[PDB]
Symmetry: C3
C-alpha cells in the first residue's frame, strides 16, 4: 500500500498550493460531475499533478457558503486498481481536516418501486467483494487512522439522512426521496437476469460498482458519511432491452439540475 | 495481461500452419472430449506448440459439413490461472474469424427435477467470482475487442436455444432437454451441504467451476454464444454419499454417444 | 506457495526439538487461548523461531492424558496473508503424525435463538471467499497431501459431534449445546445490518473471519476435524449499539472456564 507518510506528504502539498481549507469532501461519480460551477473561489488540480495520486480533477471552492473539496471523477476496481489505491483520497481528506464526506453515484434500480431519475439516499450497503476478502483495510492496520475492526452498522450518518429528507421537502419535488440498500459488485459488465433477481432477493435496492470501499475507509478514520445514488435502469425478465453505458444520459436527463440544487441546499445542513 | 499484438501473433501463426478456416469454436470440458473423431480433415496442435498459449489440444476439422476448431481441454481458475489466461483462446478465435462459440461442461445438478445424464441448455448464469471483482475484463479496456461495459442479459443466443430444442426433438430422446441457470464458483473442492442449499435458493440449477469467464469474453468481443451442461450429481442432506471426480464416468456413461450426436446435429443449425 | 520440502523441513525441525509426539492439534482463536495451563509436560515455541512459519506460540503437552499440540494464535486473511500461509501449520501437523484437528473460534450469532456465551458445534460451513476462487487449494495440486477435488460435505466428523453432545450432558450445563452453520467472510470490519440479514437468510448461524480455510486443508490431507464457535453478539435492526472487538471479554466472561473444561473432557473422547 501507501505509508502514513505518503498520505501526509500529499496533504501537505495540497495545503501549500491552495488557501482553501475544506470541511466537506464530496465524491462525484459516473456522469454526476456537473458541480464545478456554483462553486465559488474555485481552484482546480489535475490528479496528475498531485503527488502520489492515482492515475479526473480535484476542485476546491465554496458551495453554499461551505468550503468543499470535490472529486471530479473517482477510481474503480474494475479499472484494475486495488482498493488501497481507490481509497487513497479519502485518507488525504481526513489529513486536510475534512470532517464529512458525501459520496454519490449512479446505479441500477432493483426495487420495482424505483423509477429512472429517482434519488436514493443510501441507508446501508452490501459489500460483496468484502465477502471474499477484497477490502481496502486488508493488511496490517494503521493506528493513526483507526482501529483494527471497525463497525459498519452505523455508517451512514442518521442525522444527515434526516436533514436530506427535509431539504427535499422544501425543494417541493413532485416525487419522493427514496432510501435504501446499495449493493456493490465488481463490474465492469452489466448483470444478467439471474444475477439481478438474486441481488434483489438479498434485499438490495440499487446496484453499482463503486462507493462502498470509500465508505469503509471513511468510516475507519472517523469521517461522518452521507451518500446517495441516482437511479438509471434495470433488466429482470427473460422480453427486454439491455443495459447501456449511454445512461450517462440519465445522469444529465434531468438529474444535474435537481442534483445540483439538492447538494447545494444540503451544504447548509452539515 | 496479453497485448493486442500477442493475440494477433498467435492468430497469424495458426492461420499459416493450417488451411482450415473455422466459423465455429467449441470448448469441450471435463470428460466431454470425445469429438475428435467424427471430425473430418482434422489437424491437431498441442497447446504447447502454439505461441503464447496457456500451459490439451486444439483441433481443427469439419464436423457436419461445418468448419470447426475445438478446444480439447480448457483452463480453470482453480489451477492458479488468472482469468486473462483462461480466456485467451476466445480472443484468438475471434481473430481467426470465428463467429459462434459453443461452450460445454459437466456440472452438479441443484434442481431436484434433474437426473444424472441430463443435458441442460444454459439460458443464463450467475458469476460469483465476478461479484467480487474477479473478472476477465478487469483492467484497462481494449477497444479493438469491445466496449467498457458490456451487457450480459442476452448472452446466451436465444435462436440457438430454439434450434437446440428442435434438434433434440428430432433426436427422439426419451427424456426432455432441460434449460436453466448455471452458477460458477472457484473450486476445487466440492460444496458442502449448506453451500448447496444456498445456491439453490439463489435460483441456480447447476453448479460448476468453468465457462462463465469464457462467455463474458466471448460476449465482449461479439461472438454469438451457445452452451450446455452435462449434469452429473449432488448432496443436499446431512444421510448421504460424497461427490467424486470419478463422475468423469458419467461423462462417458452414456453421454458421449448422445452428446456427440447432439453437437453434430447442431452444427447444421448455426 | 511452499514446497513439499518446506513442510517437511519444518516438521523435522519440530520433531528434533521436542520429545512430544501429538495425535491431536487444536487451533485456539480470538481470546480462546486460555489452555496453556492444564497442559502437562508443556513445551512452547514462538512462531518466530520455527523455520518457515508465518509471522503466537506453538505449545506441545498433554491434556487429559492426550498428547496435543496447540496453536496459541492463528493467521487471518484480513491481515494480508494468502490462504497458503494461513494454512501452513495444518500441513505440518499432518507431517508430525497428527490425526485429529480441533478448530475453535469466536463468532457473531445470526440465529436469534443464540445467546452470548453459547457454544456452537460447527456442523457445516459456508465458504464465501471460496465462492470467488480465494482458496487455499488454488493452484497445482500436491498428490502427497491429497486429491485434486476434495469433497467437503462430511467435513465435520459426525462421531465427534456425537461425543461432544454427551460430554456436554455430563458437564451438567444449564443451557444446551447449539449446533450449526458457520459462515466465513473476509473482515476486518464488522457487518452492516443488510449484510447480516442477508447471511441469515442464506442459512448461516454464526459469522466469523477464520477457520474455514484450515478445515479445507485439513480435510484435503485426511485429518479428522471437529470444531466449535464461542458466540459473542450481533446487529440486525436499523435502534441499536455496534459490534466491538471488546467482546474478547466475552471470550473471558465465563467462557474460558467452561471452554477449558469442555475441551479437556473431550480429549478423552477421540
Ligand atoms: O444496471 C446497472 N448495473 C450496475 N451498475 C450500474 N450503474 C448504473 N446502472 C447500473
Ligand atoms: O457437484 C459438483 N460441484 C461442482 N462442480 C461440479 N462439476 C461436476 N459436478 C460438480
Ligand atoms: O459480529 C461478528 N462478526 C464477524 N466476526 C465476528 N467474530 C466475533 N463476533 C463477530
Ligand atoms: Mg483561488
Ligand atoms: Mg490437413
Ligand atoms: Mg519438556
Ligand atoms: Zn508548486
Ligand atoms: Zn512452423
Ligand atoms: Zn536447535
Amino acid at each position: 500500500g501507501y505509508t502514513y507518510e505518503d498520505y501526509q506528504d500529499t496533504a501537505k502539498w495540497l495545503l501549500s498550493h491552495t488557501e482553501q481549507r475544506p470541511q466537506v469532501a464530496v465524491i462525484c461519480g459516473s456522469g454526476l460531475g456537473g458541480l464545478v460551477n456554483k462553486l465559488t473561489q474555485a481552484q482546480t488540480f489535475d490528479y496528475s499533478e498531485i503527488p502520489n495520486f492515482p492515475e479526473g480533477r480535484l476542485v476546491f471552492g465554496i458551495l453554499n457558503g461551505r468550503a468543499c473539496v470535490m472529486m471530479q471523477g473517482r477510481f474503480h476496481m474494475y479499472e484494475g486498481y486495488p482498493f488501497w489505491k481507490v481509497t487513497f483520497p479519502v485518507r488525504v481528506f481526513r489529513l486536510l481536516g475534512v470532517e464529512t464526506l458525501v459520496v454519490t453515484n449512479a446505479a441500477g434500480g432493483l426495487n420495482p418501486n424505483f423509477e429512472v431519475g429517482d434519488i436514493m439516499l443510501i441507508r446501508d450497503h452490501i459489500n460483496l467483494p468484502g465477502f471474499s476478502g477484497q477490502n481496502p483495510l486488508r493488511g496490517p492496520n494503521e493506528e493513526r487512522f483507526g482501529v483494527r475492526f471497525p463497525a459498519m452498522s452505523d455508517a451512514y450518518d442518521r442525522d444527515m439522512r434526516q436533514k436530506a429528507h427535509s431539504t427535499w421537502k422544501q425543494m417541493g419535488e413532485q416525487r419522493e426521496l427514496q432510501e435504501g440498500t446499495y449493493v456493490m459488485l465488481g463490474g465492469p459488465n452489466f448483470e444478467t437476469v439471474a444475477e439481478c433477481r438474486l441481488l434483489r432477493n438479498l434485499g438490495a435496492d440499487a446496484v453499482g460498482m463503486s462507493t462502498v470501499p470509500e465508505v469503509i475507509v471513511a468510516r475507519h478514520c472517523g469521517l461522518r458519511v452521507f451518500g446517495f445514488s441516482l437511479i438509471t435502469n434495470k433488466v429482470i425478465m427473460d422480453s427486454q432491452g439491455k443495459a447501456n453505458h449511454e445512461e450517462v444520459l440519465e445522469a444529465g436527463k434531468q438529474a444535474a439540475q435537481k442534483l445540483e440544487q439538492f447538494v447545494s441546499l444540503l451544504m447548509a445542513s452539515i
